[PDB]
Amino acid sequence: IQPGTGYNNGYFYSYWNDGHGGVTYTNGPGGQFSVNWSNSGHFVGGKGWQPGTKNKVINFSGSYNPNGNSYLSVYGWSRNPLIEYYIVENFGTYNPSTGATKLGEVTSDGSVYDIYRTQRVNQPSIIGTATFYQYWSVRRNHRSSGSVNTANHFNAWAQQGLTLGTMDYQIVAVEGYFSSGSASITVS
Numbered sequence: 001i002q003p004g005t006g007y008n009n010g011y012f013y014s015y016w017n018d019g020h021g022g023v024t025y026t027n028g029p030g031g032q033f034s035v036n037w038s039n040s041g042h043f044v045g046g047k048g049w050q051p052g053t054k055n056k057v058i059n060f061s062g063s064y065n066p067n068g069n070s071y072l073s074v075y076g077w078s079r080n081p082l083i084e085y086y087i088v089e090n091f092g093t094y095n096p097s098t099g100a101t102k103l104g105e106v107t108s109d110g111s112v113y114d115i116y117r118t119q120r121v122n123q124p125s126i127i128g129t130a131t132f133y134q135y136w137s138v139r140r141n142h143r144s145s146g147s148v149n150t151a152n153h154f155n156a157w158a159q160q161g162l163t164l165g166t167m168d169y170q171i172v173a174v175e176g177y178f179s180s181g182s183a184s185i186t187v188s
């Protein structure tokens with residue numbers, strides 16, 4: 001399937017890419033999706049909710065085997081203000097917080113997370129080309145299955161001045177940046 005959003009087997013999904021090639025996104029039954037990629041471009045895909053909420057407890061399980069630059073995250077957006085956010089549970093060779101401004105720490109679901117804010121300028125977004133902040137929680141202890149109590153992150157962020165607008169979609173996402181890998185993830 002081509003990039004798009006919609007509902008599949010009861011779950012919202014979003015699949016986006018930069019058009020390069022080298023990535024196959026597949027919707028499985030229930031909350032399952034797979035991503036297989038090799039010599040990809042930049043892409044983000046996964047399943048979840050539209051809209052997300054600020055208290056959702058998100059469960060994910062399966063396999064995540066990146067070869068290079070990739071993230072596995074609870075991923076979503078707010079509007080008014082436009083914010084792209086991540087709770088990064090695992091990643092490949094590149095830490096997305098590299099060179100980023102650290103805004104605190106939070107402990108949640110069995111690990112410490114480091115909190116960051118970054119800036120995107122004239123980049124793709126859920127409202128088209130836009131300039132926006134990104135908020136990050138990066139898990140210290142990598143894992144490919146677990147539960148994320150999102151409120152712990154949103155609250156810690158807010159305490160540190162990283163506040164959100166109205167919630168748009170909220171998914172468990174596999175993101176890749178010009179790399180290879182595989183993932184098979186079930187969301188609930």
Ligand SMILES: O[C@@H]1[C@@H](O)[C@H](O[C@@H]2CO[C@@H](O[C@@H]3CO[C@@H](O)[C@H](O)[C@H]3O)[C@H](O)[C@H]2O)OC[C@H]1O
Pocket residue numbers: 014016043044084120123124125126127128
């Ligand atoms: O049809 C439009 C969609 O194409 C559009 O999709 C979003 C475009 O921006 C994506 O965000 C990037 C994902 O990768 C990150 O590293 C970057 O920081 C982001 O720029 C987002 O994932 C897509 O959902 O949404 C609007 C539609 O009109």
